[PDB]
Design an enzyme around this catalytic site. Structure first.
Site, PDB file in Angstrom:
ATOM      1  N   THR A 188       0.874  -1.225   0.000  1.00  0.00           N
ATOM      2  CA  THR A 188       0.000   0.000   0.000  1.00  0.00           C
ATOM      3  C   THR A 188       0.881   1.234   0.000  1.00  0.00           C
ATOM      4  OG1 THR A 188      -2.001  -0.792   1.195  1.00  0.00           O
ATOM      5  CG2 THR A 188      -1.393   1.525   1.495  1.00  0.00           C
TER       6      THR A 188
ATOM      7  N   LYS B  92      -8.742   3.979  -0.348  1.00  0.00           N
ATOM      8  CA  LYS B  92      -8.060   4.106   0.936  1.00  0.00           C
ATOM      9  C   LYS B  92      -7.965   5.534   1.470  1.00  0.00           C
ATOM     10  CE  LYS B  92      -5.107   0.235  -0.562  1.00  0.00           C
ATOM     11  NZ  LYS B  92      -3.671  -0.192  -0.715  1.00  0.00           N
TER      12      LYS B  92
ATOM     13  N   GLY C 103      -6.330   9.097   5.038  1.00  0.00           N
ATOM     14  CA  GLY C 103      -5.915   7.930   4.268  1.00  0.00           C
ATOM     15  C   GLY C 103      -5.484   6.861   5.257  1.00  0.00           C
TER      16      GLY C 103
ATOM     17  N   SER D 285       3.879   0.207   2.620  1.00  0.00           N
ATOM     18  CA  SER D 285       5.106  -0.415   2.124  1.00  0.00           C
ATOM     19  C   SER D 285       5.751   0.417   1.009  1.00  0.00           C
ATOM     20  CB  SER D 285       4.811  -1.817   1.590  1.00  0.00           C
ATOM     21  OG  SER D 285       3.880  -1.755   0.517  1.00  0.00           O
TER      22      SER D 285
END
Ligand code: NA
Ligand code: NA
Ligand code: NA
Ligand code: NA
Ligand code: NA
Ligand code: NA
Ligand code: NA
Ligand code: NA
Ligand code: NA
Ligand code: NA
Ligand code: NA
Lengths: 173, 173, 173, 173, 173, 173, 173, 173, 173, 173, 173
Positions: free
Chosen positions: H1, H33, H45, H125
């Site tokens: 993500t 998101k 977010g 990530s």
């Protein structure tokens, strides 16, 4: 082990502790880890086995002889042999060498390494503790290289369990 | 295993226990871990397999033969080979060698270790127990090297589960 | 850490080093690991954290108070609690307790250990080195319990990298 | 540890070694791991901590008292408490109990266990070595239970590094 | 992280760097790792998770409120809860607390550590570099506690990859 | 380490930081990780051990000499030897090589990687941060290859704890 | 990686994605994983490094040359070498080869795999996703081999994080 | 993500990718998101589960309501609840929130975090890849916050295997 | 995989499943793992790669030819080559061979193996399930070898996840 | 251990072997692994620790008492507690229970398994060998449930090294 | 295990295989993994233990009952409880729920996942194989939701060794 070298006011000093460990116990407390090479003109300290050191220092001596005492060139050639010879690659010692001109660290995996403006070098498990103390001393006192090395080795010996307080210190000139 | 050596009043002794273990059981309790080499002039003790010991002691004798019986030089030469030869690198052991001049620990990790001023050396899982006892006895009694070795091996044997009390002790002269 | 206790000629002594380590470095070198409990009539040494020690010694004193000062009974009762209580089970340590009648090792694994006939007990990473030295000294010299503890702690300190040479030694009477 | 029990010709014997180990070293060599319970009518051996044993034996005594000395019923009740009480489940000792009628092993994880036609039982790291020797002796000699237990403990002690040769042996009647 | 505390001539200082790393990357460079607690009478710094440390700081204040603001007693009580509470045992951190009287390191492994005679404490991955520099400066210069903390933090930051050179330094009074 | 290479408008640049880390500490900050090979016609940078990289650089030159200086062919041949030779398989590193025609990443896992249409390559722990910044700059500015490499290296250095901001940047022609 | 092959109505197609990953990041997104061999008469796809692929495909062509272009025979011969040669055993990859007669998967573990009656083969981390899609399309639609390969690669790419949607597709005739 | 936020020229933007992964496969490619909270005045977010997010955002909304829309105070209170409530501590999501005044990251383990002069924040990530691209763009172009976020998300999506290129981007005002 | 062989009433049967697996997925469901060798007089089943099998069976054929069809002698010679040739030692397949005289299992690590009075042999992950079913059937029914093999393979296929129910069965005569 | 249950023509049988192993040695050969519960109306067998199983058997009876003796409902309730209770989660075992209506396997991993149409269940290391033999016998003979259980247990015992041939077989009615 | 759901032309179907595995063997091949809940108006499929499923479905129905049958709201509420309740956190499973309005995947890791626009959801070890097949069928055929589920489960069953071909399929309306 802790080996540290400081150059200040025309003097260069290499000093080391005397602990030889096997696992979590001490095999020897009075090892001499700093020697004089090239008829006394080069100071050499080592973290590693004495047989490894004997091998590396004899080879370094041969290099110095053929390179007319030039430390950096001799060191570069030593590191080249070290990583290219299958027998030498088995040697895991770490070395610090210093003459009246320059100081250097040499290892089988890192080749040659020169100091920063500091002119302080250190190796061994306790190396960074001596380095921290030496930098503090060089930057905030007028202490001689010898005093700084002695004091820094003591500080490292009191923190690192693999470094003791029985020192061998050599100075040039 | 426990091998311990003490040098006192012109006598040097090397002694060891007799236990050979596989995991947590005893395969043999009367192993002879100390032998005389070089025409009976060198005492050698080993912590490791018997076949490994044979290989290493045979090579050490060849070194002795080509280096005029000088123990330290032969020991360093053996260590260099042990550290770098593909075949020898597979041999896991520790050795103690002693002659009328000095005593040494030889390892396969590039180190040759000389004793502290008390002239005591010990190797093996129970080595540090015999070392502790030997140092206490040397610094606080007038016992002979032989007596100290015997008592230290016993103390180590009663503590280390891998060291027993069946000793082989050799003395020089 | 090294804690060692010797009882000789009506005197019992418990002594310990002062090193507190985190990984391979020293956090403190002058820790006091031996204290007097129960109105000064009980000597207690511990290998473990200081807060853990406080909890365990406080509980041991409560046991002493409800069991008429009987050391063995109080020790067994403490061990049962230590072995079974959810909170105490989290405390990792070894203790040595001694009074004018006897000496004991208390563990958190359901064991209370009495000494061999030599009346020597030792705990900690360097415990067996002090134990080896103490046994040699007790069986071969006429040194006092205090002298043996001091010499054994020193021998252990020179061998175990986690034991230093800054001692705290308590004697009873 | 090795505890072994043999019943032959109207006699029952329980014998154990004396080694208490912590890791690969010996904390005690003269432990008594076999006791007499119920005013001497029951022999009980244990592999585990002395505090665990004290706890389990006191509880077993209470059971024997309420069950009019019936060994099997008392043992079954002990095992029930052992696996149902959260405090008792923390006790990892292993026990062997024997009276003039029967012999049994009791553990927190295996409950109660009775012998085979053999009437030989053994527990501890060295248990199967004593068992092997005892079975050989029962089947091929006319040796008494006491002789078999003594001989079997010795054989196990010479093989298992956690079992020594300082035995405590109790016999009924 | 590097947190270092120095007490010199009535001044007590606790300083820390500001780097927060996720894996081997810098997530933030201006973290505040030293805070004033208990009505501004206590300085506290932490090595470890921010949430974890905040939870411990709150609990420490509750201990101070409970024990009349006595630092050592409150630290031991926090260490005991930290060592045994199910949720607190999950908290990974080391703390340094200091008031006008004393300074201490609190760990989650049952230890509360007082400094040596130099009155310096340091924690975190770069703690020992700051400790080495601080001891060098306390023993060889007349610099203030504040200056020594700033200089030691900088030396640690140039060595530890997880310590930067953006400091938060707090002093009492 | 971060090495990044950009080719834009006839200019090919390879740049790298100068940090060498031992564990989580900085051993040196002025390492030269980009070198000119093959009579200055090839630029090469490495992520990994210095000795290892030097060995690979020498072998790559031998491949260039063997294959008429063709970069791709020589890289594939080096990758094949690296993948299968007993000693080379022990070498941990990743390389970037570039000449006036093309740029490539060479690995020891059987891969030779050509860049995407942006003509950018990056390796090392901070490689992807430099890669992200470089792609952003190539796609949205008219900056030169040299400027993009310096800016991308700086962005990587402010994020990766093993990458510093002392760069060695080489360009062709 | 995803490589998939479908043979339908006299046409055989081999297609693959373009993602080359190192850990959890993309090193290259436009790799060509399918090539034509043997004078354009053989289609070959590989999941593995590019240098490994070169070695294996070169050897496969040599096999083709000495075995009169017979695919199965050449594949088995390649597999035997790959399985037993010291150098080739170091190459970790999976291959799919197809000619006008048949299709095969060649592995380095001594296996050569023929397809089920649907004539579909797939390799790579996302291979089974393309395989599932291809089987559904072959059994329930009249789509061409080319169309099925394209749609299956897309479905696999949207599921497997190591397979992207940049395809290389080759068809025979 | 990857979630990234950039504030420039009076505008603040939060954008995220749409990939939901389980192990090395994709469960969903069009996740949203980034949401608007507090009647559209706050952009939020999240990297984590939708149920975790629903929980955290509902709680944050309650906080904003009671703190008259003050972002930092509401965020600080949220982080406090997050690390103190045993149920909330189970939530591992990471959040980025931004209103017309400031931008912040909030996590259960790191509490609240404010940006550097950059006014760029990123989590997930792929966060550092977007951060590297965004910093390059902010420092070397006149691109709007929206353009930078879109471009940075794309760069991160092309490098991180857990981030895709289906973005949700929200802007204020 | 499951290969099973049963000999009853003058008939010998070898049957196997058809599943080829890679990790936890199926690469092929219709593999033929039983072949006829030596012009139909020998039945041979194999668990392993097809290339390994091709190699081993061609070698076995050569042996049979030189040993005038003697199964046991040919098998013994095959096993000898298998463990002595460095290339053959790389082959991990397991084999079952049967002719009108005897049945045998042959493996690289176990050499040759003959059946027990049972005349039932089985290999593969599902081997013991087929063996259990076959023994039950041979001992309690009058079913032919063929019926037993078919039924046993089915039972093994329904239990072992690596064995399916698509069988190849060969019978002699 | 092997426990197998068969229901055929109104008869329900549960049988088990009697071997209890400690490590790879036989501790006992006459264990009773099948018991009658709930006023002799339920048969239960276990694979795993005896104490653990006994604890679960008691709790299962309590569930039967609570849920009007309905097997499935009580099994699901036991499985739920077993899955979540702190102490029960530490219990390693698998159970088979059966009454006049149904048979079930209960696990500690949230599963309650009903048999297939053959009405056979088996658990333990040798469970699948008994399962294979039992299915073969149910599907191809007219043997009784009791005979099939005894024969299947014997077949399992001749294959599994942890299953012997001393059975306890219970039937209802 | 494989559970897959497809919604097409006003029909929603949830289907699953029947394999329950323990390690690499099958405990049951006809498990029913899909059930109808909430008065037959909700379809639910689960990958996990049957007792775990019972607990979770019972709780989901309670949620449905208190949240007016709203699937998404009930799913999120269930996920929050599953994610945070000590007991529920021990339940390892994945669920798919579907009603006449929508379909959802519920996890124990704080996520509730909605399908892509194709309205297909799949869970279990073989889930992605059925997902790949279902997407191919939905995008390239006019097959009914029921037909797609049946064909996708079959394709998954032939690939995943932990998914079989014994299906339970439920449809709504
Ligand atoms: Na030290
Ligand atoms: Na011993
Ligand atoms: Na020491
Ligand atoms: Na013994
Ligand atoms: Na730093
Ligand atoms: Na950096
Ligand atoms: Na993908
Ligand atoms: Na991506
Ligand atoms: Na199967
Ligand atoms: Na057996
Ligand atoms: Na399957």
């Amino acid at each position: 082990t802790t080996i540290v070298s400081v150059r200040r006011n025309g003097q260069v000093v290499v000093g080391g502790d005397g602990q030889v460990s096997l696992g979590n116990t001490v095999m020897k407390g009075n090892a001499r880890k700093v020697r004089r090479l090239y008829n006394g003109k080069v100071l050499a300290g080592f973290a590693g086995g004495t047989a490894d050191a004997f091998t590396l220092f004899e080879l370094f001596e041969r290099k110095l002889e053929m390179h007319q005492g030039h430390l950096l060139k001799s060191a570069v050639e030593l590191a080249k042999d070290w990583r290219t010879d299958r027998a030498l690659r088995k040697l895991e010692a770490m070395l610090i060498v210093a003459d009246e001109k320059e100081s250097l660290i040499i290892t089988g995996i890192g080749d040659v390494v020169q100091p920063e403006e500091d002119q302080i070098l250190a190796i061994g498990s306790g190396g960074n503790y001596a380095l921290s103390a030496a930098r503090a001393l060089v930057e905030n006192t007028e202490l001689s290289a010898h005093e700084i090395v002695e004091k820094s080795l003591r500080i490292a010996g009191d923190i690192c369990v693999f470094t003791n307080t029985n020192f061998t210190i050599e100075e040039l000139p």
